Design a protein around this ligand. Sequence first.
Ligand SMILES: Nc1ncnc2c1ncn2[C@@H]1O[C@H](CSCC[C@H](N)C(=O)O)[C@@H](O)[C@H]1O
Ligand SMILES: Nc1ncnc2c1ncn2[C@@H]1O[C@H](CSCC[C@H](N)C(=O)O)[C@@H](O)[C@H]1O
Ligand SMILES: COc1cc(C)c2ccc(O)c(C(=O)O)c2c1
Ligand SMILES: COc1cc(C)c2ccc(O)c(C(=O)O)c2c1
Lengths: 328, 328
Amino acid sequence: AAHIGLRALADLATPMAVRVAATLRVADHIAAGHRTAAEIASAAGAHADSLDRLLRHLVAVGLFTRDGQGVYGLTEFGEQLRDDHAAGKRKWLDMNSAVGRGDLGFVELAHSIRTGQPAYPVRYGTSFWEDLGSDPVLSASFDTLMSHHLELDYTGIAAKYDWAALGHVVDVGGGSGGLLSALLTAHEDLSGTVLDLQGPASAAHRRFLDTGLSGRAQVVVGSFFDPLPAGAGGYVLSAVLHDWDDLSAVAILRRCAEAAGSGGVVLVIEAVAGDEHAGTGMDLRMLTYFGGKERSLAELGELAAQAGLAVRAAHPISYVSIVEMTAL
Amino acid sequence: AAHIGLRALADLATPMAVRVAATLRVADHIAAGHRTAAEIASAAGAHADSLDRLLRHLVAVGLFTRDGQGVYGLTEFGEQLRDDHAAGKRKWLDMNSAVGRGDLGFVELAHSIRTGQPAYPVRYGTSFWEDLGSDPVLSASFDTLMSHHLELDYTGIAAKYDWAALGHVVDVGGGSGGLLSALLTAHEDLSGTVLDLQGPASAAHRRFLDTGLSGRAQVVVGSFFDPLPAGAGGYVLSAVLHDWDDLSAVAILRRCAEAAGSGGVVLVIEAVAGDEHAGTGMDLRMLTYFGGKERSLAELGELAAQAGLAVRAAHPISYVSIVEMTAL
Ligand SMILES: Nc1ncnc2c1ncn2[C@@H]1O[C@H](CSCC[C@H](N)C(=O)O)[C@@H](O)[C@H]1O
Ligand SMILES: Nc1ncnc2c1ncn2[C@@H]1O[C@H](CSCC[C@H](N)C(=O)O)[C@@H](O)[C@H]1O
Ligand SMILES: COc1cc(C)c2ccc(O)c(C(=O)O)c2c1
Ligand SMILES: COc1cc(C)c2ccc(O)c(C(=O)O)c2c1
């Protein structure tokens, strides 16, 4: 529903102003005693007059407060901008994090809409994965973000499905290993391995070491486009397929089919078109980032088919779903 | 206000989706019989799949509608996206027009907040004026938009001030001549001169010839940083000062002061802080485009001082104001 002006509906000043405040950690500086533009600016490394102008615009938006002496304060809503807030939103808007950086790729949406190709490269001169692969710090922030997305969307994932019955699970593209770390912590006799590029896989390793799970959890550095560790009880694809177009998606699913064999299970875990954490907005982000797409339960089925797999179940877990596929 | 989440407040997907729809003229294609993704896409030269995904996100926003068969239709609100619409909004969002292209400069807002410098260059490798001066078609669209801004904001200008008394007015930075054309049409004994760069000045000239005002309206190509046609009854600066930082603004005001001498009147016409069509949004826009800014009566006055001028009056007209300055 649009009960707000067309031009205002297309405003970029506010979205960018919020992201800049999130990047300059303005809320943190405010709650830490810096109240005036002059202060916040020096504490953040910004131009005094310019920052003041950004703040005044954000006061109008409803995130800040400004008193007679130019003393800025946080609104009830502006609290969400603090890096220590419960919702952990600020890091998603930070222009330095992978997502706060990729989202700026939307400024090239026209290219995707015309060609069907990702926009991220247009603005950054390289794919998203290539970017993370050459910037270790950038890649770490992405690992942290997906780790947070797990808490956000996979709430209760442990019990919602019968994992223990798998014995050994392979988390294909499992990042820092947050999911496996959660599955194993809730299933004493379960073991598994995280398969991912070297950055996340090494982060997964560092985690299992500290977490005390190295005895049951292992990492394997590799591309899920090549053969995967074979014969596991289950292969999980958590928020992976939507990052790829149809050709790549079957490529990935196919590999899982091979490793799964006529006795394993392939579990695609993601927000299916319909879920409350799966909107048209997210679908366009997948398009602009990697040319991926959010898919319906029917569309995943078509992909499964082309990879010799068949959906057998689809349990909704909070904001997302777990679709279970087995040998055709 | 904050009636919506922080991350939603920072959403770029929708602002860009609207701007892309505006650029692809989707609404016009729909109202003209093309109501299917394949049809609209083909008529606009977009990727069928990608366009369909853009439209679905836009029906969700409330601009379009779609039936079970995939037939798209506009809505009470999506009607404003058609070019033929009264409000004339679409052209402002078009990524091809000068303002639809300039606004994308907001993705570099951070640069402006940190340095006080304009963002436009960061994105386009050259200043706004430099860009328009090397691309006549781009400069033409800008003239049209400023022309339209006169209708949107200056409604009534003709009568709210005693123009006829000036005898001869020079519109410093008068663009394609709309304002002067409106003043002289309402006052048959008044004459004037539009002073602008090549592009607008010739557009003004063409306008005057066709509308039969060449007998009273004259064009003069030149920079308002250099001397100006002297001894005029009044020199107008319509929506010019907010395009410049304090130094340049003073330079410009000086020239007008000099040309006006002890007998002319300098008139600044623009939305000052407080006036409508004036907001923190516009202020940030001025900052990212040219490092200019929206100013208050107080602020213009300090500039007039630095230019041997002094505010004598300030009549509000519609959503803007006329600040009448005179020599000290
Ligand atoms: N070719 C490839 N081979 C293996 N992993 C890859 C890959 N390309 C990308 N990835 C990984 O795929 C993951 C997708 S995003 C994170 C998914 C994770 N299971 C979670 O839900 O948090 C990232 O860790 C990314 O590094
Ligand atoms: N150095 C310069 N000398 C003269 N005109 C200039 C200039 N730099 C920019 N301009 C003109 O300043 C104008 C500012 S925008 C349009 C202002 C016009 N009075 C209106 O209200 O529509 C543009 O026409 C721009 O081309
Ligand atoms: C689900 O996996 C992903 C992957 C990417 C790239 C994302 C990018 C931006 C986001 O906001 C989210 C999100 O979940 O909120 C996101 C999630
Ligand atoms: C007043 O002169 C200008 C100059 C520029 C560059 C503008 C850019 C975008 C706008 O929306 C507006 C407007 O008035 O609406 C605008 C006005």
